[PDB]
Amino acid sequence: KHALQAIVLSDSYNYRFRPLTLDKPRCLLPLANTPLIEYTFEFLALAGVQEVYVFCCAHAGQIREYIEKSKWNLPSSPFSVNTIVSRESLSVGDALRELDSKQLITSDFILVSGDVVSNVPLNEVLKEHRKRREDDKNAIMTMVVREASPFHRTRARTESSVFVIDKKTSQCVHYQANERGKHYVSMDPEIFNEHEELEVRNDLIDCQIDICSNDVPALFTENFDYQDIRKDFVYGVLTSDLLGKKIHCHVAKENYAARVRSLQTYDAISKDVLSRWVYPFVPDSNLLNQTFSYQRHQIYKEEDVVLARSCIIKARTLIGAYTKVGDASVVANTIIGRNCTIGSNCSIDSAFLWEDVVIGDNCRIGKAILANSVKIGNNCSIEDGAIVAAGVVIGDNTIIEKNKRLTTFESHSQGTLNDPSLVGIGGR
């Protein structure tokens, strides 16, 4: 009967990952040798979704190309996916106001403002949502969030928020952000006359996964000013600007649910999925017919991988297939794409390597992100915070400083092709 719909909002959070989104869209970059949206996808499939639409604003072809050739186009897919294009830098709401303008919302549905790594069965949340809906049609949106630590390494400033919920009916009655200049928390006491038992929570993680009802898109057209959901929308509801309607919060107390959005989030979440937190969504399950396998201390390898004898592999590190590693080289807490090649007698700590990447002998690297098919000569060295793009080769006996993002095309950043980079240039 009831068609379950769902819409993913790619590109909308393409911001921080600027140096590499120009190489390819962020929805397509690999988390743990696995592209982002797949983590979001199986989550969607886990929700029992039957119909999905994806907004695109960059490399839509490159996006749609993968999708058409993805496993989610085959008849085995639990849901039919179609792609939609619009303007670039898609601010939310403009999607919703464009959405109902196309008229395709059968009933309740979900919303994801980016790409999500999670494993929570939402099937409960729906019956938790559709129930209280069928008596109060003004039940507009159900928000789902993860109970965690207030200082939890996965709670970031974007998600660092404060909710106020009714302990009985789990209705969010007040919400605000946690910007550095918000000392006090204020709310009008009109709620107390309508609510007996309340709970103030700062231990949450705004997963930004939102169960939206049917009126929502049309409501956005009636309220064009709303552009950010968590700032313009919900605030308008609680302020009775948008009147007579109410939302609801579902706090998750088990399993995992986080959203890849910031560079401060990639490294964290990568260290989460490696720590099994998103079982069964793990490399050794090998969703896309990979050849992974678990090893102790959270070491992950694939079939047909070249390791020396003197090469030493510490913990919390994964390795894609067809990838070689030189002698007396040490890798620790890093992830590595497929087909890569590591020189001899090198130290790689907490780095992030992608597909078919080459590294020469004697190289020290830490907290670095190496894009696809980038070569680094011998005697080189990097440090914590660096970022490169595709093909941005570096010549031998070179050094890169912290947080110094690079690129292969001049547009707004620094760096060019070959050897001289920081000291000396290869094009500027």
Residues interacting with other proteins, by CB under 8 A?
A: 150-151, 162, 167, 178, 182-189, 192, 195-203, 253-254, 296
In whole angstroms, the minimum distance from the beta carbon of 276 to other proteins comes to 12
* Contact in structure between 274 and 294 (CB atoms under 8 Å): no
Closer to other proteins by Cβ: residue 127 or 296? 296
Instruction: Tell whether omega for the bond before 280 is within 30 degrees of 0, i.e. cis.
Output: yes
Closer to other proteins by Cβ: residue 102 or 167? 167
Taking the CB of residue 64, how many other CB atoms lie within 10 A of it? 17
Closer to other proteins by Cβ: residue 165 or 282? 165
| Token pair belonging to 414 | 């620094």
Q: What is the DSSP string of 215-233?
A: SHHHHHHTTTT---IIIII
CA angle 276, 280, 285 (to 5 degrees): 95
In whole angstroms, the minimum distance from the beta carbon of 192 to other proteins comes to 4
* Contact in structure between 348 and 323 (CB atoms under 8 Å): no
Residue type, 336: I
CA 208 – CA 37 distance, rounded (Å)? 15
Closer to other proteins by Cβ: residue 135 or 184? 184
In whole angstroms, the minimum distance from the beta carbon of 347 to other proteins comes to 19
- In degrees and rounded to multiples of 5, residue 325 shows phi and psi of -140, 130
Closer to other proteins by Cβ: residue 185 or 288? 185
In whole angstroms, the minimum distance from the beta carbon of 419 to other proteins comes to 40
Pairing of strands 257-260, 115-118: antiparallel
Closer to other proteins by Cβ: residue 134 or 196? 196
In whole angstroms, the minimum distance from the beta carbon of 42 to other proteins comes to 26
Closer to other proteins by Cβ: residue 165 or 387? 165
C-alpha to C-alpha distances, 285 to 39, 157, 301, nearest whole angstrom = 13, 32, 12
In whole angstroms, the minimum distance from the beta carbon of 164 to other proteins comes to 9
Return contacts of 294-298, CB within 8 angstroms, 24+ apart: 298/274
* Contact in structure between 204 and 143 (CB atoms under 8 Å): no
Reported as type and span, the H/E element at residue 150 is none
In whole angstroms, the minimum distance from the beta carbon of 33 to other proteins comes to 25
In whole angstroms, the minimum distance from the beta carbon of 48 to other proteins comes to 25
Residue carrying structure tokens 């049309």: 218
In whole angstroms, the minimum distance from the beta carbon of 346 to other proteins comes to 23
149, with CB counted inside 10 A (0-12, 13-18, 19+), is exposed
Closer to other proteins by Cβ: residue 203 or 349? 203
CA 87 – CA 296 distance, rounded (Å)? 47
DSSP at 254: S
* Contact in structure between 109 and 7 (CB atoms under 8 Å): yes
Closer to other proteins by Cβ: residue 187 or 305? 187
Closer to other proteins by Cβ: residue 277 or 354? 277
In whole angstroms, the minimum distance from the beta carbon of 167 to other proteins comes to 6
CA 172 – CA 266 distance, rounded (Å)? 29
CA angle 85, 88, 93 (to 5 degrees): 75
